[PDB]
Amino acid sequence: RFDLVYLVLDKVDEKNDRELAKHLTNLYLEDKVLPVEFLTMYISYAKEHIHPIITEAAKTELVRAYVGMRKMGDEKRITATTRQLESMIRLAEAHAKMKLKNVVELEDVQEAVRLIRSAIKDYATDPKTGKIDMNLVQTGKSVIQRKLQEDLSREIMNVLKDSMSFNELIKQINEHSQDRVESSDIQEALSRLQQEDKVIVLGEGVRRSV
């Protein structure tokens, strides 16, 4: 629910580290044109007097930008949000509020879109997803649970061809079925199997299939 999330980092690299530390040393030397104060009421005057008004050309620019984002994100992986469209609209309105134009021009639309796209490439992984932000369970994570649920179902059916506790399930899943995967994934997938009524769990102990 944040329109912009900035991943401000201090990653090590001697080129920019030299410049930053030199600026720090200049700052140390300092103590022993910029509107420094006029902005604090300039912003208020812009907020009061200026009422941004967004145009139909801005509308078309916004629509094309959003559909382009959806397709570039596009298994057609979901990307960004209609809320992200609301965010670009609001950022373009803000860009209209500054420079005292009170009209959301076309340029503001692509400026806000560029800011949003840069932020998205920042906070998302290298294969920009647009889904990890709204959900901890990413596609590359959801595939793990979808594998574990079917693996558990098949293992149960093989056992029947009857009931075992959690530790025995761990013995024949993490050892030879696959690598040393996390244990709670098994019970999380068993919950999903319970939702589909495929198997039943008899308390903390044994568990069987219907």
Binding site: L62, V63, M134, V137, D197
Partner: protein
């Protein structure tokens, strides 16, 4: 008298059903099924009671499961802002008191009304129904079924009335809906409570090139100024008039 004439035009209208369906949540494009379900929930049934003293629910309980980008929260906002005696709540349980009620000691035990109490004879707009733990879902099992909550914790024992309509909006398990599994599979929410829900609405954000264009254009056009067949004030009087009916 002018409102009498407006109501007479409303009742004598032939496409009044479809017009009201379209007039529900003008801020939302499409999803006419959800609009119809919300309209029915607002109308409700008849809260009959048998001679043996057993009461029969007239409230309608609706759970609208959908992806995070869907318009669940917008529907909840429209309902809470339009339906009288309606409150909004989330599955996070922001209030210290539980979603039903709570008892608190004074420095004696006194009752703090939950989100389920204030919306009595109205609609309890519930968000993030998947976020709330089943520990609180079981607390509303009797509330959304028997319309009552019985509490006997410490020195206080009473049964409070919850004659509310529940509007649940929960994301499917894993955030995104999975059509490969049934509605039971796509939710962590369990059978006994959903058997008490009347209708289930599944809304998905299909990666359709055109549908996204109409959605974006509609949103920007709303940002411009939606023309509903009947206004909210005009609709409320007809809803009140229909509530007087006991078919």
């Amino acid at each position: 008298s002018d409102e009498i004439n407006e109501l007479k035009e409303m009742v004598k209208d032939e496409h009044i059903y479809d017009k009201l369906v379209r007039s529900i949540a003008p801020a939302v494009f499409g999803h006419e099924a959800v609009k119809k379900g919300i309209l029915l929930q607002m109308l409700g049934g008849v809260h009959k009671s048998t001679v043996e003293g057993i009461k029969l629910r007239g409230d309608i309980n609706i759970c609208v499961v959908g992806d995070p980008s869907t318009s669940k929260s917008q529907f909840l906002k429209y309902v809470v802002g339009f339906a009288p005696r309606s409150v909004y709540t989330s599955g996070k349980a922001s209030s210290a008191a539980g979603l039903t009620a709570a008892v608190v000691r004074d420095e004696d035990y006194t009752i703090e009304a939950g989100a389920l109490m204030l919306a009595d004879n109205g609609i309890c707009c519930i968000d993030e129904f998947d976020k709330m733990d089943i520990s609180d879902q079981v607390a509303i099992h009797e509330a959304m079924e028997q319309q009552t909550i019985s509490i006997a914790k410490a020195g206080i024992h009473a049964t409070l009335n919850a004659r509310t309509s529940i509007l649940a909006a929960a994301n499917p398990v894993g955030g995104r809906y999975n059509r490969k599994l049934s509605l039971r599979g796509n939710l962590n929410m369990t059978a006994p409570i959903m058997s008490r829900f009347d209708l289930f609405f599944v809304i998905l954000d299909d990666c359709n090139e055109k549908i996204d264009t109409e959605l974006a254009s509609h949103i920007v056009d709303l940002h411009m100024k939606i023309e509903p067949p009947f206004s909210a004030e005009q609709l409320r009087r007809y809803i009140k008039y229909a509530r007087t009916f006991k078919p």
